[PDB]
Amino acid sequence: ASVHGTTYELLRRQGIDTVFGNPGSNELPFLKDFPEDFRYILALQEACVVGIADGYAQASRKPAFINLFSAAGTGNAMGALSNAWNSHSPLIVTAGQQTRAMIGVEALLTNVDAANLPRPLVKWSYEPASAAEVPHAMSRAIHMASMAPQGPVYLSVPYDDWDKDADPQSHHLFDRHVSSSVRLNDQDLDILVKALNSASNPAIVLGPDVDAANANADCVMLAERLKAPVWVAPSAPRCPFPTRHPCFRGLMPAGIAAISQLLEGHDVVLVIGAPVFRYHQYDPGQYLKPGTRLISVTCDPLEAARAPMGDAIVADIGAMASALANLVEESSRQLPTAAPEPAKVDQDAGRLHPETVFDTLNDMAPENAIYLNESTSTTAQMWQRLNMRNPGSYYFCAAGGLGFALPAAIGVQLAEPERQVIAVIGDGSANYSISALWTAAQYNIPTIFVIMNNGTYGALRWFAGVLEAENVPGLDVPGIDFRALAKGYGVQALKADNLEQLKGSLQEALSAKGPVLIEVSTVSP
Amino acid sequence: ASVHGTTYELLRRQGIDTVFGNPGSNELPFLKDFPEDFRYILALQEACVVGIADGYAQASRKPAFINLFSAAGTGNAMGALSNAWNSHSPLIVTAGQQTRAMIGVEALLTNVDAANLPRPLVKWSYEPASAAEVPHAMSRAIHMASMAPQGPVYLSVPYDDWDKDADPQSHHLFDRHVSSSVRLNDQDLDILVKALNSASNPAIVLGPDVDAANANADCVMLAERLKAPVWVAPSAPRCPFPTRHPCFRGLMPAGIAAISQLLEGHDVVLVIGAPVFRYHQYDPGQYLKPGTRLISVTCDPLEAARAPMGDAIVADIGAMASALANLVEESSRQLPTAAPEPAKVDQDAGRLHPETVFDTLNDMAPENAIYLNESTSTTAQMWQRLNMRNPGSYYFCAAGGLGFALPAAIGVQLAEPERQVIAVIGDGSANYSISALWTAAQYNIPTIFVIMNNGTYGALRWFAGVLEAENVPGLDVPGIDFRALAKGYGVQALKADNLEQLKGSLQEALSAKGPVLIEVSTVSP
Amino acid sequence: ASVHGTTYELLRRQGIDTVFGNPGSNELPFLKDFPEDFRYILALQEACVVGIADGYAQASRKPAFINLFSAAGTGNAMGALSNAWNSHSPLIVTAGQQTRAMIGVEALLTNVDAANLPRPLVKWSYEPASAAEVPHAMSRAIHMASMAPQGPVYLSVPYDDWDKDADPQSHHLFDRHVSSSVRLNDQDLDILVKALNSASNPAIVLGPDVDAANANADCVMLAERLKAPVWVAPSAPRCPFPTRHPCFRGLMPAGIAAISQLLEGHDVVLVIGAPVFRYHQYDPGQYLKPGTRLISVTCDPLEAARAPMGDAIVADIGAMASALANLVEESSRQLPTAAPEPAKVDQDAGRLHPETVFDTLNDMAPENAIYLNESTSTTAQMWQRLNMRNPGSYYFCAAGGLGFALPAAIGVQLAEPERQVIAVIGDGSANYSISALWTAAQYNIPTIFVIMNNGTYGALRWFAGVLEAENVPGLDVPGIDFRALAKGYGVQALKADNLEQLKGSLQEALSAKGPVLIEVSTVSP
Ligand SMILES: Cc1ncc(Cn2c(C)c(CCOP(=O)(O)OP(=O)(O)O)sc2=O)c(N)n1
Ligand SMILES: Cc1ncc(Cn2c(C)c(CCOP(=O)(O)OP(=O)(O)O)sc2=O)c(N)n1
Ligand SMILES: Cc1ncc(Cn2c(C)c(CCOP(=O)(O)OP(=O)(O)O)sc2=O)c(N)n1
Ligand SMILES: [Ca+2]
Ligand SMILES: [Ca+2]
Ligand SMILES: [Ca+2]
Ligand SMILES: [Mg+2]
Ligand SMILES: [Mg+2]
Ligand SMILES: [Mg+2]
Ligand SMILES: [Mg+2]
Ligand SMILES: [Mg+2]
Ligand SMILES: [Mg+2]
Ligand SMILES: [Mg+2]
């Protein structure tokens, strides 16, 4: 067998059947004789390729395979990799290298010092020392991406390797099963359970690895047993809990002082599947107030190491959540009372308040909708206004890198064909990965894109205000016609200048057979 | 003085007055109180920011200053940095970092292991250990980018540094002059000159560092004195010689065997300002044929080290070209005869042959036009069909990374307001950095964009053919409306479905007061 | 509190009370006011510092703290770090950096790009962005070194940081408990146990992480229950099993073909706490023969990923070994029969055969002796001839880097004051870290050093023979007087030119009150 044949067999035996890519000459010898059981999803720029694959991986809860062109293609994708690192997305990034005979002279398209290029944003990065090593290196890539804590990996392959003879002993790679589905030993788990059972006023904080593990239902059981309020850890990339469950208390503010104040009076705070904590704004104060102890369960040693407070347990989130939910006592305390519904913001017959948009989406979207957020000034209101009952219902750029949601929404929709995906994206954010629209059109992936158009980088204007920073350039983005951009890439386009038009456009979009972009005129800050 | 004030003073004293950027929160404390003598050029995605700055730097022959957002912004720009590395573009890339107090906990927007992120695509990469060090670090960045061999550099700055007190001793940085304008010592230069004078059949090969140095006119004098044919080194990122000068022999094929065959019979081959050589296709054979010796003058030790043949001299291209041109004897050999004009390709009343497009551009464009190429299957014909008399008349992505020409054409046009810039870009290539169009519209930079629309990644289809590679996915890009994309970003749009319409559209574009995009229907391969 | 005070409090609260070091100016502000409850162990060169700390950490099964001088000191230790990486040794390596004000100018003693220096041999490498971050960074270092898979970490600290005010919120670091004591979930563990119970002819292979975890006794129980032969994985850095237990089958040959042949006929092979496998010699063949399946339990994702065959489980070795030993059925198969005693090699009244030396050590050493091996041509015989009943009884350089055993033997002896440490070191190997002898003398650490003097790099001569490699230089090391070297560093020295003298010297050494070096005249290969 050839390295080509052996590698595709390894991929299929390990459950991979889709290649997300933008092709180049170094990759043609890999892509030739493309297997009939695989599918190739083309995107027009590499940030889009990786964003689509990322959404697909996160929603499918399995690794996604990417093929990029040498250094330039890899480089174009590095902002996308920054998000993938923070979301623990299992991405296998392969890039084609020049033929071994032309690497030394640094021919055009040579990826120089290739393994260093994507660092520090990958778990593992490698170029094999010979063609026959390629399948083994691919095996390593698959498992490194997939083991807890999951994350992106990078493999560079000289294009002449594919046609070479494979090592017959590579067959031992095909069916390897590698598990990191582990939890705390019985003795220490019993100690943890007793601490939870004995708490007088416990609180629970959940992060994105709960949703990645599909541990959501177990966390609901845990919260109900402990009669504990549940918060989502700050800067949330996913939604780990039903947002109308009585225990739910919403998104934590991303500040040190704000969080310790929120947790004051809670004697034991159990954090599951989150960094402690992904703070954002400068908000100095106490990490915890006296009387509060924190216990963190994380899948990531790097998270456990850097927490400024609390104990930590490094283990699989799915296994730990299931064990805790089934071991803790049913507290006799009263179940927390559900948060009240948000207020209806006054809305005239003109430009839309973001609150109106979210209320209307919540009214009209199916109960199993999936939302993506890249409307940076409206996140708090989005979290308060969308009832998300099911797992896998929310995604937001985990490293704060814009250009995620538009392509990721396409990948999520590909992963979940029966769940309507609705991406709510600011006019500023929409541009970073605008060409991803073409992939939705070409493959008829019926994502709905809602563009919140207020003509400005609103979150930055707001921050400039808090800094009292005057004379900051580059904050306004006037003069973009999103319906024309959608037309450019073959996506049906609608406009909504007021509430009547928003409802009409959403009704049309929800009944459409393909992707739809709605440009919404929103109020300026 | 503050670090902010001192740093802007350093920048202005070192000749920097423009910031190319896409802003973020970590950069707001740098951008606040933006000096009234500086200008800020916003682009909507970071590949576009860096591409614009790159074109500006290359055309202006001076460093360009860039400001990006943390890791995600830097990452989005890394494909652009790959081109900049290969073109020796003097780019100062700054990125904002989290406040020092929040780096340890890895707050959102922390650029982790920041200096490693852009490696290996930068000459120098650094984060200062204290606020007061920032001006000195910026000084280092300026000089590292600017010294031969020029290239991109990276500086990460915690956002809280800007408001801190500067070291008064930083004033010594302001007026530092650093020179690498050096040439071979007299004794060894005399030896080189004698070898050139004694050659029976010399040839000259020129690369992009000749154009960067504005050594073009000196190379013309050198070629005339030696009565030598002149080739442009393969994979050419710039044009270093007047293309209708009698000595000009065109672009070298990017193959080992092809080049040694071309050089056969030439006893001394002098290469100036190029790698030896930027080969591309697999074309094995002899590096040089018996009877040919090669001497390379390069500004880059890395180039001198990796040449598989020949002697090398590492020195400034401007200084060396001037010295050689003025020292060599006037040979009594006959001056080479000019290459004949290219053939006129048969053209019916339908879709345009690329040859027709280039002939028409050559007919209608001003004699001081500047062209950018990102029409990958048509490069050879472009080189044969455009009369480029002046320096700085051609740019092509130096690392082969698409997404360069569209934004770079805007930067070049900003650098050269009196020279009409015409970017000839394939339909595939146009998408990588499509949002750059907005910057041309917003700042009214009157670049003309000619989109060669043949519906496919033509160069890849061609290569698949030579590989006899069947069943390669992802080679077709149907269904893009470039006039709608132009409308989306505020750029006047025209179509040309035939020659009559092409001439009409070019006439309109050449007389327009702003940027114009022409979508040309070209023949499919 | 100062950063100095806070950092020492953190160290003591996390169980650290010893600093292994070689001091320099950048470290004096850390070492001043050295706490009276800490001890400082000086060694004369940094390879020795790290080797001593490594032995101490491995034997104590807890992290060891190291303090080195800037780049040169760190660099001198990097061979030692290569061993520490392979042995999963929890080492906290700190190095002093120049004062922040002098880093920019690259004053003498500046550690440039410090965090990159020890890569790729550390789990985590870092320089803090401010003085107040130092305690948090130290906390991260402690936990990163200590979490599974354990390993070395690196922290660079500007010397001016120590006197600065600490953040009062650093107190939350002091008592953090971080656990990776995890095992496979119940459902999947039950599946594993059933596979073991159902095996017709199981085999067990154990690696160094078993001894590190003190899982030895649990593995004995497991082997007895399964009635399974037990091998030590190749290139063994530690001894994980009693070497005279009836199940013990010795050290596996470090070859692919040799191992698959050894395992032929075994239907299930359970590997615990080893890479699969640390092969060494070129010995191509099948990874496993038909009929053999392999299951690996490893603490290291990197090991699980790179195994060329078998299933893997990534978990804590102590927790897994205990669970398996207590869950498996008692097989009704016959317990394996003990290996026969090794043959007595003929020995005349002249130079010593290595076999004679090991037999004599086994005869005379206490039953709880600890051996270190750096006698590279005699390893197989050592493994056959020493009865090691207890855990922590054997160490060998895990990355094959010589210079480990001499200093490590001092660290082990410091960790285990009631167990006589005997280091058996070749004349070649003895030189790499010879100055470590001084530390044993100065602190009166009563290690016994047995120098096997055959005048040559015997293992290399042997390998040259198998390569049929003629005319290899540099294989002989005549003219070293080890008794004089011992005298040089203050260690009692004895010679043994024959068996009578060996017995006499060992008797004297075993009764001595301080360290002793015995130079043994061994047979030449
Ligand atoms: C790749 C990248 N570049 C720049 C930024 C910085 N950025 C700016 C550019 C965002 C403003 C987004 O504007 P929007 O129109 O999408 O939404 P709002 O008007 O609601 O803020 S928020 C802020 O994080 C970023 N996060 N990512
Ligand atoms: C960033 C990036 N991605 C992928 C490629 C590989 N690429 C492909 C995508 C190009 C085809 C360009 O298509 P085009 O429409 O712009 O021009 P032609 O049809 O004349 O080839 S040429 C080839 O180098 C690349 N060079 N750079
Ligand atoms: C730091 C280092 N340098 C060189 C070597 C290579 N080396 C050579 C130098 C060793 C020979 C050791 O000689 P010895 O006297 O200690 O023992 P033998 O005579 O029994 O081989 S074995 C072999 O691995 C090494 N392992 N480590
Ligand atoms: Ca906006
Ligand atoms: Ca095309
Ligand atoms: Ca020896
Ligand atoms: Mg990098
Ligand atoms: Mg247990
Ligand atoms: Mg699916
Ligand atoms: Mg001179
Ligand atoms: Mg100008
Ligand atoms: Mg369980
Ligand atoms: Mg002890």
Swiss-Prot record, chains A, B, C:
Domain of life, source organism: Bacteria
Keyword entries, A-Z: Aromatic hydrocarbons catabolism, Calcium, Decarboxylase, Lyase, Magnesium, Mandelate pathway, Metal-binding, Thiamine pyrophosphate
Gene3D superfamilies, A to Z: 3.40.50.970, TPP-binding domain
Cofactor note: Binds 1 Ca(2+) ion per subunit.
Amino acids binding Mg(2+): N116, L117, R119
Cofactor: Ca(2+); thiamine diphosphate; Mg(2+)
Pfam families found in the cross-reference section: TPP_enzyme_C (PF02775), TPP_enzyme_M (PF00205), TPP_enzyme_N (PF02776)
InterPro entries listed in its UniProt record: DHS-like_NAD/FAD-binding_dom, THDP-binding, Thiamin_PyroP_enz_cen_dom, Thiamin_PyroP_enz_TPP-bd_dom, TPP-bd_CS, TPP_enz, TPP_enzyme_TPP-bd
Reactions accelerated catalytically: phenylglyoxylate + H(+) = benzaldehyde + CO2
Region: Thiamine pyrophosphate binding, residue numbers: 376-459
GO biological process, one term: mandelate catabolic process
Residues reported in the UniProt entry to bind Ca(2+): D427, N454, T456
Pathway(s) this gene product operates in, as recorded in its UniProt entry: Aromatic compound metabolism; (R)-mandelate degradation; benzoate from (R)-mandelate: step 3/4
Enzyme nomenclature, EC number: 4.1.1.7
Molecular function terms from GO: acetolactate synthase activity; benzoylformate decarboxylase activity; flavin adenine dinucleotide binding; magnesium ion binding; thiamine pyrophosphate binding
Family matches, as PANTHER family: BENZOYLFORMATE DECARBOXYLASE (PTHR18968:SF133), THIAMINE PYROPHOSPHATE ENZYMES (PTHR18968)
Subunit-structure text: Homotetramer.
Record family assignment: Belongs to the TPP enzyme family.
Annotated protein name in UniProt: Benzoylformate decarboxylase
Organism name: Pseudomonas putida (Arthrobacter siderocapsulatus)
Gene from which the chain derives: mdlC
